[PDB]
Amino acid sequence: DNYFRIHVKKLPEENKDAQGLWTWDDVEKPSENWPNGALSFKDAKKDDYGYYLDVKLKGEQAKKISFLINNTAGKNLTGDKSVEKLVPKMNEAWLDQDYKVFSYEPQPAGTVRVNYYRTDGNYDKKSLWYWGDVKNPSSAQWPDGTDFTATGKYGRYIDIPLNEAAREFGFLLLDESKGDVKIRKENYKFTDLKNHSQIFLKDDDESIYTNPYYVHD
Ligand SMILES: OC[C@H]1O[C@H](O[C@H]2[C@H](O)[C@@H](O)[C@@H](O[C@H]3[C@H](O)[C@@H](O)[C@@H](O[C@H]4[C@H](O)[C@@H](O)[C@@H](O)O[C@@H]4CO)O[C@@H]3CO)O[C@@H]2CO)[C@H](O)[C@@H](O)[C@@H]1O
Ligand SMILES: OC[C@H]1O[C@H](O[C@H]2[C@H](O)[C@@H](O)[C@@H](O[C@H]3[C@H](O)[C@@H](O)[C@@H](O)O[C@@H]3CO)O[C@@H]2CO)[C@H](O)[C@@H](O)[C@@H]1O
Ligand SMILES: [Zn+2]
Ligand SMILES: [Zn+2]
Ligand SMILES: [Zn+2]
Structure with missing residues (x-):
């Protein structure tokens, strides 16, 4: 019921199990308890492009999804990122190798x-x-x-x-x-x-x- 899919081309670090997706703004439950409250890449699904995680939106009218990739201790690997829905039906974004x-x-x-x-x-x-x-x-x-x-x-x-x-x-x-x-x-x-x-x-x-x-x- 109203998820947003974030695709990741390449995780900043080698082990998926030590990395997670920390989110805020228009998501249902903004991450808490840094860094472990992040959504783990351990259970990330994969497609042609790389991994992906689905994040439940605070929505509607969810419009801004902010996020980073972190590790178990205790780095902000990507820097802070944000996506703004162009339209309400926009439901996926892609992060490339340079984030x-x-x-x-x-x-x-x-x-x-x-x-x-x-x-x-x-x-x-x-x-x-x-x-x-x-x-x-x-x-x-x-x-x-x-x-x-x-x-x-x-x-x-x-x-x-x-x-x-x-x-x-x-x-x-x-x-x-x-x-x-x-x-x-x-x-x-x-x-x-x-x-x-x-x-x-x-x-x-x-x-x-x-x-x-x-x-x-
Ligand atoms: O209005 C509040 C703010 O909301 C948004 O904050 C975002 C940050 O920009 C993100 O970077 C992230 O914050 C993480 C942070 O990345 C991380 O380092 C960690 O901070 C640790 C710190 O490393 C450590 O030295 C020690 O002091 O514990 C800190 C615990 O805070 O955790 C931060 C989150 O708690 O996520 C937040 C949203 O949760 C917005 O971007 C800001 O502009 C705004 O001021
Ligand atoms: O190939 C690049 C070129 O493509 C486009 O031009 C095409 C024309 O749009 C198209 O009408 C056609 O025109 C040719 C006629 O078929 C022919 O009878 C005679 O009049 O010469 C015309 C050649 O211009 O084909 C061309 C492509 O060959 C595009 O519009 C151009 O701007 C572009 O440079
Ligand atoms: Zn043809
Ligand atoms: Zn999913
Ligand atoms: Zn342009």
């Missing part, structure tokens, strides 16, 4: 994952035409188009090999079932290819979202 916090699972360096969600459909035959600061620019024969074939958490996706200190890229969402393929006529253009790793798109929405909740900023 940065994301609203999505971050992908390996030198890639941008382009996520595409359709309210309908369909999906087949949807593809991405892309260019600019990418290893393999669409080429080609208009209008195809790297197919949206893989399925993830946020609709379908394509992983794009970056190159360099990739800065900025452009793309068009394509519906190959059509006489007019473009979905949106005008070129999309994205900068922040350093500051992200995933982008989120949907339907014929003009906006390039930077979180899976399709809210601006």
